[PDB]
Amino acid sequence: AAMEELQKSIGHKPEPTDEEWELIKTVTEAHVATNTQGSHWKQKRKFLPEDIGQKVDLEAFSHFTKIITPAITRVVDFAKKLPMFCELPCEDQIILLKGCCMEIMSLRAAVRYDPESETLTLNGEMAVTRGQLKNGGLGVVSDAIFDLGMSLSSFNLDDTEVALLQAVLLMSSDRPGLACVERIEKYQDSFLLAFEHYINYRKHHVTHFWPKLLMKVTDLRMIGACHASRFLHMKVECPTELFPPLFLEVFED
Numbered sequence: 001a002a003m004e005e006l007q008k009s010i011g012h013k014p015e016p017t018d019e020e021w022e023l024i025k026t027v028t029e030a031h032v033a034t035n036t037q038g039s040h041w042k043q044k045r046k047f048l049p050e051d052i053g054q055k056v057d058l059e060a061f062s063h064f065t066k067i068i069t070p071a072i073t074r075v076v077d078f079a080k081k082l083p084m085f086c087e088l089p090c091e092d093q094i095i096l097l098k099g100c101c102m103e104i105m106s107l108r109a110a111v112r113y114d115p116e117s118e119t120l121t122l123n124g125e126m127a128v129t130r131g132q133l134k135n136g137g138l139g140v141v142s143d144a145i146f147d148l149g150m151s152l153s154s155f156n157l158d159d160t161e162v163a164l165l166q167a168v169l170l171m172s173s174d175r176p177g178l179a180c181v182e183r184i185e186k187y188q189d190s191f192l193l194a195f196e197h198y199i200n201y202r203k204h205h206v207t208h209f210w211p212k213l214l215m216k217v218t219d220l221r222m223i224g225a226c227h228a229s230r231f232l233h234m235k236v237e238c239p240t241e242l243f244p245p246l247f248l249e250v251f252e253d
């Protein structure tokens, strides 16, 4: 903990300390419990009819918002199982959640990318294509998520890495309106540090793994920001009635 810089300067790659291993277990379990069973959506997935999602294709949009509420609640459930999140005020809770929701949902869809069928599986239950997701309301956001998915294939991420990534997205102190900024940053730094150490232990046969991984954090933030804009365009090209209450609550002030 106190011998970070010096440990790096020598050339050693510090692995998780006992305190961090404990933190890693909590976050991983948090993710695993609120996410689909690994390597299961593959056999249980259902491809969306090729005729849907071939303006906003309201039919495809319909199919997506039908399962969007559970996807969102899974993210709240994840956040709930992290003590650091619970230590925070109600106002900060909501702000943090409204800001990372689409970032985490996208990472989750992205890691369930299948190069064979060239599809993503939403909620591990609905296999969709780039065009289908694009026409269903996401526009270029679909492109961004699929591009992310194709890229993540080489990273070979496990439940721990995806979980830590989600924790880093969640604890974003720059979220506007936050009140407990400096402690939300302490939490994030803590996650980032356990994360880097986890990566050293994992030793991916990939060059500059950590920095490349960090760039993904930025891409996920962009996907989120970009989706905020896609939501505005949705409220115009879509019947207000096809917007589940929680969907509206989380993305719009």
Ligand SMILES: O=C(O)Cc1cc(I)c(Oc2ccc(O)c(I)c2)c(I)c1
Pocket: 061, 064, 065, 067, 068, 071, 102, 105, 106, 108, 109, 121, 122, 123, 124, 136, 137, 138, 145
């Ligand atoms: O797969 C998961 O667990 C989470 C997940 C669930 C869904 I439904 C999803 O698609 C979206 C997201 C935002 C949006 O405005 C529209 I219309 C569709 C994505 I991307 C990810």
Ligand SMILES: [As]
Pocket: 080, 086
């Ligand atoms: As709680």
Ligand SMILES: [As]
Pocket: 090, 091, 094
């Ligand atoms: As509140």
Ligand SMILES: [As]
Pocket: none
């Ligand atoms: As509470």
Ligand SMILES: [As]
Pocket: 179, 180, 183
């Ligand atoms: As505070």
Ligand SMILES: [As]
Pocket: 140, 141, 144, 222, 223, 226
């Ligand atoms: As974009």
Ligand SMILES: [As]
Pocket: 225, 226, 227, 229, 230
């Ligand atoms: As955009």
